[PDB]
Each structure stands twice: as structure tokens, then as C-alpha cells.
């Protein structure tokens, strides 16, 4: 028998990713997924505010039944707990201006300047991945600073996620001025397959479901359909 009620901990921090209604209602892209799952699981879903750093402890304190946030999933993390409801693939994407023709390849990247966001696997990984390749990389401490450089042409391209890029980049007039270099490259191991919900292994039955429900969404293209609606990109590409 499945749980009578499911407690989810979601703390909106990125409008594009989530948000809150002044009417007291809760809205967000990740929320819509949970609802669809709630029906499939045939149970009640309750959202509780709480920061990631608190989500992990809360899960241990049995305070929450599941964790739903931007938190990325990784093999190393899987060894600790169980993950599912995978939202989207968080690989990488290249953003360049139509003026400069750049294709998904380290070669064409050689001699080109690339900007990255400090405090990430890209910079650290790049410092070695794109280091011996003879590629110049710059780390920034501002998210908007990176886009500003791109719009200025100070950077030949930036390694960002597809969903995050389109969700914001394209979702903003900035993308209109420039938008090219879809699929790029990057180690998926750093961020795993992408992002998902943090569940405990004991969730043998729940995991079996959520996973089953996810497969159904793919069969009916519910996931892909929603993605195409929210934004025009490729989930597979990540």
C-alpha cells in the first residue's frame, strides 16, 4: 500500500524554475511534474518551503517524504540515496552569434574565448578538459555578467545547460539578438544524467512507480510535449 500523503520540500528561488502565487497557491515547472506524478501514484502531495541545505537534513529527519528542487543528480549521489522523476538532461550548450560560425567541436573552439560561471564543475573540469586543448577559459562571478559579455561579443561561446539556457537565454530578448550552437559537449558524469528528485533507497515501491510513471510520460510524449510548450529545445541533447 502506498503512502496516504506525500510530503515534498520545494523552495522556489528561480522564477523560471519555480515561483509563488500571491493568492497562496504554488506554481512552477517542477510543481507541474509532481502533480502529474501525484495522480499516477494516486496519493496526496504537499509542498513545504525549505532550502536545499535543509532538504537533505529534513529527509533524514523524516520531516519530508521527497525532495524536489534544482538539485542535480549524480552517480555518487545515487550511492547515498535514490533518484528519479528526472526532470531534464543538464549537459551543456554553446551560445554564439550568427556572425561567428561555430560548430560543436573542440577544434573550432581552439583560439576562441569561452566564459564560465565560477564555482562550478565546468571551470574546474575545464581547467583540465579545455586546458590541454589550447582553449582560453574565463570564470565569472556573475550570472548576468556572462550573458552581458556574450551580447557584447567578449566571449566566443559559453558552456551552459540547454534547459537553463532556453528557459532564460531565449526566454529573454537577449536570445533574439543571438542564439546558435545548440548541442555542444561536456562530461555528464559531473552533473550526472541531469536533475531529478532525491528519494531514499527504501523507496523500492515508490521508486518503481515514479519511474513507471516517468516511462509513461515518455510514451505519451507528455514530458517532451510539455518541454516543447515551455521552450523549444532538445531534452535528449540536455
CATH architectural type of the largest domain = 3-Layer(aba) Sandwich
Per the CATH scheme, the topology name of the largest domain is D-Maltodextrin-Binding Protein, domain 2
N-to-C SSE string, H for helix and E for strand: EEEHEHEEHEHEHEHEHHHEEHH
Spatial strand order of the main sheet: 4-1-5
Rg calculated over all Cα atoms: 19 Å
> Could you say which overall geometry the principal axes of the C-alpha atoms support?
elongated
Give the amount of beta strand, in percent: 15-25%
| Structure summary, number of beta strands | 12
Share in helix:
25-40%
CATH superfamily of the largest domain: Periplasmic binding protein-like II
Number of helices: 11
Distance between the termini: 36 Å
Describe the 3D structure:
It is classed as transport protein. Keywords: Periplasmic binding protein, HisJ, apo, transport protein. The assembly is monomeric. This protein has 238 residues and is of the alpha/beta class. The protein has two domains: 1-90 and 192-238, 3-Layer(aba) Sandwich (D-Maltodextrin-Binding Protein, domain 2); 91-191, Periplasmic binding protein-like II (D-Maltodextrin-Binding Protein, domain 2). Helices cover 39% and strands 17% of the residues. The chain contains eleven helices and twelve strands. The strands form five sheets. The protein has a three-stranded parallel sheet with strand order 4-1-5, with helices on both faces. The chain has a three-stranded parallel sheet with strand order 9-8-10, with helices on both faces. Helix 5 (121-129) links the parallel strand 8 and strand 9 (136-140). The longest helix has 16 residues, at 204-219. The chain is elongated. The two termini are 36 Å apart.
Amino acid at each position: 500500500a502506498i503512502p496516504q500523503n506525500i510530503r515534498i520540500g520545494t523552495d522556489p528561488t528561480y522564477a523560471p524554475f519555480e515561483s509563488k502565487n500571491s493568492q497562496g497557491e504554488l506554481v512552477g515547472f517542477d510543481i507541474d511534474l509532481a502533480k502529474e506524478l501525484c495522480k499516477r501514484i494516486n496519493t496526496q502531495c504537499t509542498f513545504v518551503e525549505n532550502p536545499l541545505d535543509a532538504l537533505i537534513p529534513s529527509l533524514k529527519a523524516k520531516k519530508i517524504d521527497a525532495i524536489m528542487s534544482s538539485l542535480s543528480i549524480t552517480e555518487k549521489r545515487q550511492q547515498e540515496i535514490a533518484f528519479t522523476d528526472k526532470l531534464y538532461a543538464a549537459d551543456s550548450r554553446l551560445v554564439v552569434a550568427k556572425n561567428s560560425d561555430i560548430q560543436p567541436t573542440v577544434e573550432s573552439l581552439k583560439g576562441k574565448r569561452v566564459g564560465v560561471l565560477q564555482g562550478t564543475t565546468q571551470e574546474t573540469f575545464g581547467n583540465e578538459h579545455w586546458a590541454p586543448k589550447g582553449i582560453e577559459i574565463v570564470s565569472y562571478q556573475g550570472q548576468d555578467n556572462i550573458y552581458s559579455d556574450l551580447t557584447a561579443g567578449r566571449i566566443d561561446a559559453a558552456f551552459q545547460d540547454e534547459v537553463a539556457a532556453s528557459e532564460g537565454f531565449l526566454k529573454q530578448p537577449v536570445g533574439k539578438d543571438y542564439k546558435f550552437g545548440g548541442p555542444s559537449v561536456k562530461d555528464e558524469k559531473l552533473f550526472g544524467v541531469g536533475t531529478g528528485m532525491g528519494l531514499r533507497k527504501e523507496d523500492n515501491e515508490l521508486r518503481e512507480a515514479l519511474n513507471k510513471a516517468f516511462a509513461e510520460m515518455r510514451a505519451d510524449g507528455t514530458y517532451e510535449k510539455l518541454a516543447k510548450k515551455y521552450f523549444d529545445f532538445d531534452v535528449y541533447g540536455g
